[PDB]
Amino acid sequence: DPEVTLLLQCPGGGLPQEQIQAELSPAHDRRPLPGGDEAITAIWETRLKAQPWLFDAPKFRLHSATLAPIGSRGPQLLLRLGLTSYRDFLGTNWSSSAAWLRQQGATDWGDTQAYLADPLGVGAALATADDFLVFLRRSRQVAEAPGLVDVPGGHPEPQDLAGQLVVHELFSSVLQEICDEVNLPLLTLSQPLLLGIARNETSAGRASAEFYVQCSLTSEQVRKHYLSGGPEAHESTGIFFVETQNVRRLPETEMWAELCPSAKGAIILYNRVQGSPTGAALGSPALLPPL
């Protein structure tokens, strides 16, 4: 799977909010482009002169994520975050010249991402009470991955002592994205666990945090809530469910070719961190069938 790389796999079956530190610093920002940020302004002006209803929005930037030594007490992850925007994304990661920017960043900074906006996404492996994961079909009208299968998620917008508020907004944002798109009540959702971070090599390496969330509703009840919103309540064009039993071998199915890279990242991390049992009971052959 060349279009997805794992940056981080979390220990312990996934990390809760209380175990993560963030450092939000202008040191973690994109570097100014070699010939100046005028090239970003030119792309933005061209776009607004065709679609004048578009608007910019701020985004968090992922610089790096360092895990503590496994089995240690205290905070287990440090996220190094900067600030970026939708405009900077369109002028860098989504530019036809994104590969040239990656080569220049390796040359100038020893960092293939130094000249890239790299907005941080969030996605969820969302499990039902009857042990299915939730999938969404993307519209054929969207710019990126039209018509492909996705999981719930989005790109959170800004508003350890500014740190703890930023981690809170990341965890809150994945629940809000589930409530807004799947039309579920907030009180049917568990607090998220962070599974890891995946990079989308088709979008010049921008990263998504991938979370596990459990819902107290069955697959039939989740379907009713999603559909009872009507066509204007969701950006997706359909919902469907796969048994967690069957998620284990999803990369061997015809579905795998239809999944967008950030959804591939969510499913690889679900299989490595929530699946893949380590103990004698769940690891026994009748419960973990060979092949």
Ligand SMILES: O=C(O)c1ccc(NCc2ccccc2)cc1
């Ligand atoms: O060309 C566009 O307008 C365009 C719009 C979304 C898009 N993808 C989703 C997205 C990525 C990063 C930040 C926010 C959203 C790609 C391209």
